[PDB]
Design a protein around this ligand. Structure first.
Ligand SMILES: [Ca+2]
Ligand SMILES: [Cl-]
Ligand SMILES: [Cl-]
Length: 223
């Protein structure tokens, strides 16, 4: 997150860290056994870390559980990042509580202008590099389909939306990928891609989770 604020320990109870010896991606807990992340986050040897503020310190609310199964979207294209969504099932169900809680899936697509909360452990600098160990949050409006396409000609599909600020200074960044965009209690976005971070006229691009609910419910139902 660039231009963000320190969320507060466990204030984003659906925020997961995907670990392979190190945090490499975000994810969102959608029930006791299942995480939604970015398909571009896919690799093997994933441990899901829940109840996490400082990913470098054992602070006392963590649940560490290995991925049993990963399911990349059948139509995920790694070149275009179209359908940048993936499901990870846990070996065991997490204990849900105030600090580790599922986030609701959308029953409807959110609209441009809606305030959303973007979180993750990604880079905090638009130029240079610096990673935070505590979770960062950013409040961001969804931008119009048309201003998204203007910013990124030939690149935005019907499964993407932009959120943030055209003036720049405030964006998601490297290490935020797979992390949530929650809008009015509902998971509307996955941190997907962008041209640099927090650059003028280059906002964050997010997987449009409302397109994928059928797939998520049907997949959870049989796996
Ligand atoms: Ca920790
Ligand atoms: Cl702060
Ligand atoms: Cl389906």
């Amino acid at each position: 997150i660039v231009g963000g604020y320190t969320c507060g320990a466990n204030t984003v109870p659906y925020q997961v860290s995907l670990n392979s010896g190190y945090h490499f991606c975000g994810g969102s807990l959608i029930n006791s056994q299942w995480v939604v992340s970015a398909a571009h986050c896919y690799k093997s040897g994933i441990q899901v870390r829940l109840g996490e503020d400082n990913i470098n310190v054992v602070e006392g609310n963590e649940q560490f559980i290995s991925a049993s199964k990963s399911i990349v979207h059948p139509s995920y294209n790694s070149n275009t990042l179209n359908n940048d969504i993936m499901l990870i099932k846990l070996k065991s169900a997490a204990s849900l509580n105030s600090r580790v809680a599922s986030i609701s899936l959308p029953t409807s697509c959110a609209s441009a202008g809606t305030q959303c909360l973007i979180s993750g452990w990604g880079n905090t600098k638009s130029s240079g590099t610096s990673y935070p160990d505590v979770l960062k949050c950013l409040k961001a409006p969804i931008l119009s389909d048309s201003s998204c396409k203007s910013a990124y000609p030939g690149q935005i599909t019907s499964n993407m939306f932009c959120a943030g600020y055209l003036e720049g200074g405030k964006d998601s960044c490297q290490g935020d990928s797979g992390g949530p965009v929650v809008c009015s209690g509902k998971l509307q976005g996955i941190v997907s891609w962008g041209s640099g971070c927090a650059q003028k006229n280059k906002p964050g691009v997010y997987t449009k989770v409302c397109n994928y609910v059928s797939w998520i419910k049907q997949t959870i139902a049989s796996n």
